[PDB]
Amino acid sequence: EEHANMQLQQQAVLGLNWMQDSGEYKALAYQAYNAAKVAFDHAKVAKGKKKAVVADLDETMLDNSPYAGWQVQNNKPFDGKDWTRWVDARQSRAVPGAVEFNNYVNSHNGKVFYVTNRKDSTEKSGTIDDMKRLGFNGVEESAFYLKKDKSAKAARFAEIEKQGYEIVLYVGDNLDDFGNTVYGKLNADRRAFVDQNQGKFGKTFIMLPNANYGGWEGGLAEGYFKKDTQGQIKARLDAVQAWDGKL
Amino acid sequence: EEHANMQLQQQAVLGLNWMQDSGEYKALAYQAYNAAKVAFDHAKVAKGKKKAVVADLDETMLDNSPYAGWQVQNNKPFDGKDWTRWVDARQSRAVPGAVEFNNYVNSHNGKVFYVTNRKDSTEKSGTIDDMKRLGFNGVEESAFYLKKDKSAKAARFAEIEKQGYEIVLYVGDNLDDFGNTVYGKLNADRRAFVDQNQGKFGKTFIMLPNANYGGWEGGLAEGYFKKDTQGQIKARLDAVQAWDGKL
Ligand SMILES: [Mg+2]
Ligand SMILES: [Mg+2]
Known part of the structure; x- marks a missing residue:
């Protein structure tokens, strides 16, 4: 519709x-x-x-x-x-x-x-071209770990470590940019992860704001991304916490 | 409507x-x-x-x-x-x-x-009661500079300084929480202020995220807050920057 x-x-x-x-x-x-x-x-x-x-x-x-x-x-x-x-x-x-x-x-x-999670096979060329144009240094292909078979990122972090690196900090807009422990999980578990790592934010986990999409959207309801449009609308509206208008 | x-x-x-x-x-x-x-x-x-x-x-x-x-x-x-x-x-x-x-x-x-900008005359009692309940220390009345006649905050900052304080940092969700220089101004001027103070953020100007309301909403269009509902809808939609769908 x-x-x-x-x-x-x-x-x-x-x-x-x-x-x-x-x-x-x-x-x-x-x-x-x-x-x-x-x-x-x-x-x-x-x-x-x-x-x-x-x-x-x-x-x-x-x-x-x-x-x-x-x-x-x-x-x-x-x-x-x-x-x-x-x-x-x-x-x-x-x-x-x-x-x-x-x-x-x-x-x-x-x-x-x-x-x-831009795709290695179909989205790499545009990504690299844009980053070069935008002024990023170090955008040779080997700097990139684009999505192949898995959206969860922990395995790619491990690949980097296997190449002799120690990862000193992570930058992201999605908690799934910090590991796999709340990948595919609902928002209660995702908030719990944040509470359990309170001291890391602004230190070793660096956050950017994204009010438009992310793991938190799927986190609104079980099986959210498989619901139809009406179902996703309902999931969003049902998640709203509202004052009852009373004292 | x-x-x-x-x-x-x-x-x-x-x-x-x-x-x-x-x-x-x-x-x-x-x-x-x-x-x-x-x-x-x-x-x-x-x-x-x-x-x-x-x-x-x-x-x-x-x-x-x-x-x-x-x-x-x-x-x-x-x-x-x-x-x-x-x-x-x-x-x-x-x-x-x-x-x-x-x-x-x-x-x-x-x-x-x-x-x-909670109001000194009508909104103080609830504010103080909530803050006590929420566990804030130091919520005696003299810690508060609630709104009286002006929404711009610089004059209240100056009052604090006159009491023998040096303000070491500001915390806010609205650029108007850092001074008056872009108060009532449109978003181009507000972005310019941020660029001119790039190094202060996360140091002496501490930002919290607010995607729901603020000076940036009024900043979407000249006289936004005086427009009717249809006008505000149009102002929001006209502010959207969209890909044309072409390569
Ligand atoms: Mg992202
Ligand atoms: Mg505020």
């Missing part, structure tokens, strides 16, 4: 305005990358290890907000086929502070590895 | 789900307060000054998301009269990490002052 597609996508509008237009969003991005630099500079690794930083791409280093804008304007729920065309369009922007942090790490005895 | 009120409020749903339900939101709050503690501990003030921290309340230390939930469920645009009832309902929650940071500052040779 067109009506349902419209309602689902309209629900993203205010958060999209915030991400695209606000100075507040920029300030949060700068806050994250300023904290990340401090953590990188303080980091020490085991003898014989090289220093690695793991960075997510989408909504962490790369800004894909125009794709979300297209979804709103065309009443289009997420579809991987549309996403692949967006990547191929080579119009990604950089998240504020990301390029500077990336290039600083790479020029100060570190290496940033991009662990991302 | 009921239809317009519905559309305007539905546009907040996804960002509200994110703020209310996600672990990611909690992680951003912990990141902010972890960074704030580091900045406080590092701060030095002029001889003879006392150390102050200025903190915003709404969506910085206090969580009012159930009011937003009520707006969504009842198709209610913001109204100060409803807000006053919400405050009186004494159901505010605490932003994660805020109480711990607040109490740490107050027990380590600092003082937190609450500079907030």
